[PDB]
Design a protein around this ligand. Structure first.
Ligand SMILES: C[C@]12CC[C@@H]3c4ccc(O)cc4CC[C@H]3[C@@H]1CC[C@@H]2O
Ligand SMILES: C[C@]12CC[C@@H]3c4ccc(O)cc4CC[C@H]3[C@@H]1CC[C@@H]2O
Lengths: 245, 11, 245, 11
């Protein structure tokens, strides 16, 4: 019943099965986009995705073995990085555009409807372009998203005794299993050992850019919140506030 | 921190 | 004369030879530390290190092959991550403390002298603890620091024609050589292929936390600047302003 | 962006 006894194939199957439902943006919005209407659509979508993210995280091998306090910390840390990697993945087949949902495809100029948004859209578009150049596969994407969940908040727990040490060790062992899984997928695809290590490094280095985008996205959302332009649900509010606490 | 902590505990 | 024709041993030798001079903090400061005096010491040290960082970056294989505009972009992106990784490396042998310089060893409670500083000190201390648990070697540290320089700003250039594409490709090939170098060092240390891939992933995932700390450090420095508490040199001002531009 | 651009160009 342990995440640490899974084969690379069982890990991929568990991650694919964990996938949240596909959501559509709120039906028939008025034309054109105002700063308030664009922010409202994007945050309503983000809050609905966050509800399903909780269920997804509970299905990620090793997550439910952690304490409730630690599960809360990992999610509060990683939420926006996870929303962004999902967005970047969905947008790979739409050059120059972001597929927020199947009925919500935005171009960079539509990003200009919200102050400070176009700069974030550009970083997201660049990540989507990078994933396309790398020909990122679905099985690799699910490994990366689970790496974000487990890694993002792992260096920022308190020192909650020896239990905190046990928890961090557990997370690092699950992350090691995910590395083994990515390597297996690359080996099965016919990549040489040198190409396998090179590709693993390239994928993991992109996670540093996703972290940067999440920090910028966080500052932007807080600024939109403060200006009284967007109403927010408590789940999204709690996730955002964890980065101000 | 209640909402997230409560939503994680159920099933 | 190319960075792409170096063996793993030649790459390590080039990186060790690139090392900047060791600096000492400004001699005999008054007791105790004020918010202004601590900030003054830390920023004076950071500005002097930045001057030597430029010379170090010019000795990193592949850096001088880029355009001057691109070298400027990479440094503006990575400067604080590079200062932080250096600090974290120096602090490994000082648990609970940060060795800013050989004559400037600060504990977490000394961090409390500056508003919002103790939170950053805690993240730095956690990274230093992580490096100790991993038994990070000097040859691995120099590879990581060069990875930061080359990777941090690579997804944030403009689209400066086909030359931008050539530049990004060059950086990615140099990064691939550094991955090969880390793998060689691990293989020479007697690690199995599985341990080699696991360790490479663990080291690269720490770079996502360093990115996060740099973003937080940037917000903190800008806040200290704004409060008129610290005078800053133009080099440090230019580096900080690149994250507001 | 002059200071950094000028310091990089020399030697
Ligand atoms: C957080 C923001 C609103 C919600 C946006 C969203 C909404 C849904 C989704 O799946 C991904 C993203 C990524 C970027 C987010 C935006 C970045 C800045 C903006 O404030
Ligand atoms: C940028 C700050 C001042 C300069 C500090 C410094 C100064 C010298 C050095 O080698 C590393 C660091 C890391 C953290 C930096 C601090 C983080 C916040 C503070 O504002």
């Amino acid at each position: 019943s342990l995440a640490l006894s899974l084969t690379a194939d069982q890990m991929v199957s568990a991650l694919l099965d964990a996938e949240p439902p596909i959501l559509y943006s709120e039906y028939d919005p008025t034309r054109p986009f105002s700063e308030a209407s664009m922010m409202g659509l994007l945050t309503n979508l983000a809050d609905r995705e966050l509800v399903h993210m909780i269920n997804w995280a509970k299905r990620v091998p090793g997550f439910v073995d952690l304490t409730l306090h630690d599960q809360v910390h990992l999610l509060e840390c990683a939420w926006l990085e996870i929303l962004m990697i999902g967005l970047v993945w969905r947008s790979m087949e739409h050059p120059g555009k972001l597929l927020f949902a199947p009925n919500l495809l935005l171009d960079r100029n539509q990003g200009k409807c919200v102050e400070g948004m176009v700069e974030i859209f550009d970083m997201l578009l660049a990540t989507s372009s990078r994933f396309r150049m790398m020909n990122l596969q679905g099985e690799e994407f699910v490994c990366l998203k689970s790496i974000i969940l487990l890694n993002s908040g792992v260096y920022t727990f308190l020192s909650s005794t020896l239990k905190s040490l046990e928890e961090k060790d557990h997370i690092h062992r699950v992350l090691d299993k995910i590395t083994d899984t990515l390597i297996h997928l690359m080996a099965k695809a016919g990549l040489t050992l040198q190409q396998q290590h090179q590709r693993l490094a390239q994928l993991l280095l992109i996670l540093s850019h996703i972290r940067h985008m999440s920090n910028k996205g966080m500052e932007h959302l807080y600024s939109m919140k403060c200006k009284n332009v967007v109403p927010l649900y408590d789940l999204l509010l709690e996730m955002l506030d964890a980065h101000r606490l | 921190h209640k909402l997230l902590h409560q939503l994680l505990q159920d099933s």
